[PDB]
Design a protein around this ligand. Structure first.
Ligand code: A1B3S
Ligand code: ZN
Length: 139
């Protein structure tokens, strides 16, 4: 679990969105595993606008933050699940690091702010759904 609170927006993994998220929907994209819903309170998270490939992510399964090198956002294949059929997930970035079912939603940060959230993982790898291209989160 985990979300990004920026302005009147809440960003979450689409496969973990609640009824309130769907009732206050702004935008959703299955191929990215992203859903953005509206909030009445102002969120205090800064989004990064960069091409950083180093950052720090929160791993709830270890209650620890880890530094990682990560790849450029791309279409990476993702196996079937109770949430999605087998497909290519776009805007996905991989890093060598621990993650397990329950870690989705952990924020990845660089020196410029929020880069994205944990969305995939397995075999010593962890995938992050990038949010840096979503320029409307600040306007
Ligand atoms: C940190 S998530 C994780 C980690 N280690 C093993 N498995 C997982 C689960 C995992 O990869 N997915 C299940 C939920 C939907 C994900 C998707 N973005 O399509 C795929
Ligand atoms: Zn950065």
């Amino acid at each position: 679990s985990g979300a990004i609170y920026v302005g009147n927006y809440r960003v979450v993994n689409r496969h973990l969105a609640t009824h309130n998220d769907w009732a206050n929907l702004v935008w959703e994209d299955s191929s990215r595993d992203l859903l953005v819903s509206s909030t009445t309170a102002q969120g205090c998270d800064t989004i990064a606008r960069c091409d950083c490939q180093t950052g720090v992510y929160y791993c709830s399964s270890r209650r620890k933050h880890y530094p990682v090198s990560f790849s450029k956002p791309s279409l990476i294949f993702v196996e079937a699940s109770e949430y999605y059929p087998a497909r290519y997930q776009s805007h996905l970035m991989l890093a060598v690091g621990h993650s397990e079912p329950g870690d989705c939603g952990g924020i990845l940060r660089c020196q410029h702010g929020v880069v994205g959230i944990v969305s995939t993982g397995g075999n010593g790898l962890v995938g992050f759904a990038d949010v840096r291209d979503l320029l409307w989160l600040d306007e």
